Write the structure tokens for this entry.
Amino acid sequence: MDLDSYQIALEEVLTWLLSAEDTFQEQDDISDDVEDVKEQFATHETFMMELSAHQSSVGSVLQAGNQLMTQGTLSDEEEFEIQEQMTLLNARWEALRVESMERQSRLHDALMELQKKQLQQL
Ligand SMILES: [Mg+2]
């Protein structure tokens, strides 16, 4: 019942996370040209908006797993399954969050740098 609904919500999250990881992995290196950097930067900001919008769902699933585990109604096998799912979900969410943020910093700095290199050639 609450096991079932946790499992449906975990599948929704993980389906979306696997693809967001793949998309992240497939974004190209930061381009040396300011018009290409604009588009990479613009693409990644939209991605960061996507991450943010999914953050409560990740936390919501992690909270549901935690409640199922503390409440005591589940088998030992199911608990080992849930604990491993929560541990890995949390590590994947966090890896993607850190790497995406680093990517955002680099694109921000690249775009500001390339723009200002245009400006000082007035
Ligand atoms: Mg943002």
